[PDB]
Amino acid sequence: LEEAPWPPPEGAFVGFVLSRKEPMWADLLALAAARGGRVHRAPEPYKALRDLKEARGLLAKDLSVLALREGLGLPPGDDPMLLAYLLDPSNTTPEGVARRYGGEWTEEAGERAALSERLFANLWGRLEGEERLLWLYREVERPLSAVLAHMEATGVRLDVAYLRALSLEVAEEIARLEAEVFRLAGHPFNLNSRDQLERVLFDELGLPAIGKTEKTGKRSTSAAVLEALREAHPIVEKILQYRELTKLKSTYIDPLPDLIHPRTGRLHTRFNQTATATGRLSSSDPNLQNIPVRTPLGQRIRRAFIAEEGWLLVALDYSQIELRVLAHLSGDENLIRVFQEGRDIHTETASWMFGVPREAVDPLMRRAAKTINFGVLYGMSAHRLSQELAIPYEEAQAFIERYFQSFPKVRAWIEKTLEEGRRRGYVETLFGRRRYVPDLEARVKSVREAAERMAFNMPVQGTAADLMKLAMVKLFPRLEEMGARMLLQVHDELVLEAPKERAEAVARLAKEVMEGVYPLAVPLEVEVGIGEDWLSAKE
DNA sequence: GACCACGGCGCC
DNA sequence: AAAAGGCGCCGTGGTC
Ligand SMILES: NCCCC#Cc1cn([C@H]2C[C@H](O)[C@@H](COP(=O)(O)OP(=O)(O)OP(=O)(O)O)O2)c(=O)[nH]c1=O
Ligand SMILES: [Cl-]
Ligand SMILES: [Mg+2]
Ligand SMILES: [Mg+2]
Ligand SMILES: [Mg+2]
Numbered sequence: 001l002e003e004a005p006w007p008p009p010e011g012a013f014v015g016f017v018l019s020r021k022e023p024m025w026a027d028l029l030a031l032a033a034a035r036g037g038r039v040h041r042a043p044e045p046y047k048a049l050r051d052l053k054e055a056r057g058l059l060a061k062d063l064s065v066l067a068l069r070e071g072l073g074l075p076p077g078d079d080p081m082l083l084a085y086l087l088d089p090s091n092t093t094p095e096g097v098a099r100r101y102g103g104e105w106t107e108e109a110g111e112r113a114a115l116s117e118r119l120f121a122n123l124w125g126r127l128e129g130e131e132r133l134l135w136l137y138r139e140v141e142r143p144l145s146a147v148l149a150h151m152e153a154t155g156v157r158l159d160v161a162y163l164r165a166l167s168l169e170v171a172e173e174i175a176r177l178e179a180e181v182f183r184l185a186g187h188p189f190n191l192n193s194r195d196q197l198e199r200v201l202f203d204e205l206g207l208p209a210i211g212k213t214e215k216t217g218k219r220s221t222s223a224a225v226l227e228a229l230r231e232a233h234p235i236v237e238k239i240l241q242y243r244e245l246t247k248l249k250s251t252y253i254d255p256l257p258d259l260i261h262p263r264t265g266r267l268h269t270r271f272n273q274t275a276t277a278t279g280r281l282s283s284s285d286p287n288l289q290n291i292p293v294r295t296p297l298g299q300r301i302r303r304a305f306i307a308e309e310g311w312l313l314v315a316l317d318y319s320q321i322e323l324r325v326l327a328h329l330s331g332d333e334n335l336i337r338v339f340q341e342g343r344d345i346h347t348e349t350a351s352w353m354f355g356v357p358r359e360a361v362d363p364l365m366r367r368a369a370k371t372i373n374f375g376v377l378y379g380m381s382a383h384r385l386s387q388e389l390a391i392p393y394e395e396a397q398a399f400i401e402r403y404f405q406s407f408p409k410v411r412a413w414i415e416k417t418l419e420e421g422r423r424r425g426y427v428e429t430l431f432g433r434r435r436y437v438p439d440l441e442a443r444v445k446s447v448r449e450a451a452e453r454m455a456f457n458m459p460v461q462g463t464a465a466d467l468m469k470l471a472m473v474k475l476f477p478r479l480e481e482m483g484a485r486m487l488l489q490v491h492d493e494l495v496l497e498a499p500k501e502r503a504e505a506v507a508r509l510a511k512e513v514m515e516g517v518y519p520l521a522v523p524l525e526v527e528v529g530i531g532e533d534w535l536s537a538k539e
Numbered sequence: 540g541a542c543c544a545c546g547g548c549g550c551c
Numbered sequence: 552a553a554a555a556g557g558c559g560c561c562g563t564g565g566t567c
């Protein structure tokens with residue numbers, strides 16, 4: 001392309017190079033733009049940003065977040081990555097997308113600008129006639145990228161001092177556990193090494209091996225294996241506790257306080273829009289979609305996520321969402337009726353599991369039942385089921401039989417979905433998001449059946465994903481108008497931050513928007529909590 | 540120093 | 552571990 005002076009005309013595609021992948025932490029090393037057979041290279045990248053009306057091109061959101069960081073209201077526009085992702089969600093990297101749709105991802109801004117331009121042209125052409133994918137792009141993905149940019153640049157507050165204090169207490173407990181483990185082993189070793197631990201458990205103490213690892217076929221020391229061996233030797237329970245504590249310390253307690261951004265004094269994640277096979281978002285650098293909540297220490301960590309002073313967190317979470325979605329997709333009367341009657345399948349399963357009335361079910365019981373309900377729905381084996389429930393194999397089988405016998409049309413929907421997946425080569429969500437699954441026609445049964453579970457899950461999980469995205473796009477402008485902030489999405493949950501005086505009003509509005517987003521054959525219900533911290537917000 | 544596969548595990 | 556699906560990050564062992 002003919003080189004030309006900065007700035008570019010309106011509608012130009014941008015290319016840019018960052019010192020690191022995370023836009024909140026990156027230095028903008030170079031910036032260029034391409035349009036109408038011209039390439040414009042910016043002599044001063046930061047200053048040049050103010051000349052742009054929007055960020056249009058590959059990874060548009062990243063440039064937008066950096067702009068927002070610098071106090072510039074630069075929104076993201078067209079991004080070929082989003083087009084490619086909609087065509088085929090295995091399109092997840094600019095490297096792959098460039099190669100596939102007409103170019104090469106290099107480390108030069110001008111070349112990236114030019115690449116963005118021609119990729120958009122090509123990919124736009126491919127989405128012609130694809131009216132549903134086009135709808136998703138214009139009505140969901142493109143606007144959502146703006147929403148996500150603001151969320152990333154906003155960040156969330158973290159009680160750093162608290163976490164620092166927590167680290168020392170956890171360190172002392174870890175020392176206590178490991179010392180005990182070493183005594184029981186008769187000698188010290190690296191307890192963080194599963195290879196060393198395998199030798200101690202199965203060769204030195206005698207313990208019977210139960211399972212093997214996938215790629216290298218070592219004797220597994222996973223929690224599932226250790227659970228089965230809890231009553232075989234005292235060292236086992238000690239290892240399980242050590243694992244729990246060290247996992248939380250190494251992954252959350254220690255890293256997170258070090259990631260507070262110096263300017264904002266908050267913690268900033270990345271919400272990746274083209275990262276999953278089903279249409280879910282992912283979160284990275286750091287991942288804020290897997291903050292602990294199940295165990296006591298886990299809850300203490302979640303409490304470190306706090307509202308700004310004078311503000312409150314609002315947490316909203318769709319109730320039994322994939323089950324409701326399944327009701328709609330399958331059209332099963334029995335399942336639809338369950339939700340019309342305001343029933344809770346997680347609580348009911350829980351009451352059965354622990355053998356107590358539905359009123360006796362506590363949160364941890366219900367949560368346990370959640371794993372069981374979705375586990376069974378998406379093809380869990382009776383053997384695994386029996387093992388995790390410590391009930392005979394025969395009982396496990398029976399629960400799985402009643403589960404489906406309760407809801408006749410679910411299996412019917414599955415069969416139809418798989419048949420159609422085999423025919424077209426892909427499956428799709430309610431809104432037409434696609435996932436290609438060639439292995440539905442695999443000649444190896446284990447490979448084929450794995451593919452089948454992926455395939456019939458995707459329309460359900462993906463539809464739920466689409467609904468949340470649509471809800472975020474509708475909700476965002478309403479929140480702006482109320483002076484509230486959208487902070488995090490956790491799959492079927494949103495976390496907002498609102499001034500205390502308005503927090504209740506914001507909660508009510510957000511709930512109604514989420515419930516009214518796209519009516520199904522069953523009501524959508526959203527549970528909402530308000531609190532000074534994320535854990536308190538979830539009640 | 541950086542990458543990698545792996546086993547493992549946090550969340551949904 | 553086992554016929555749940557979907558993610559990203561940890562330390563280890565290893566290479567470069
Ligand atoms: N398993 C740990 C407990 C939390 C969980 C979960 C899981 C959630 N999911 C999917 C199905 C579920 O509808 C969706 C959102 O999860 P979540 O909000 O925790 O469950 P759901 O909304 O069904 O129940 P509630 O929100 O508690 O009413 O994510 C699974 O497929 N497997 C799961 O294990
Ligand atoms: Cl889980
Ligand atoms: Mg790719
Ligand atoms: Mg939910
Ligand atoms: Mg609205």
Ligand SMILES: [Mg+2]
Nearest residue numbers: 317318492493
């Ligand atoms: Mg949830």
Ligand SMILES: [Mg+2]
Nearest residue numbers: 328430519520
């Ligand atoms: Mg419909």
Ligand SMILES: [Mg+2]
Nearest residue numbers: 544545546547
């Ligand atoms: Mg892995």
Ligand SMILES: [Mg+2]
Nearest residue numbers: 371375555556
């Ligand atoms: Mg699982």
Ligand SMILES: [Mg+2]
Nearest residue numbers: 193194195563
């Ligand atoms: Mg290892």
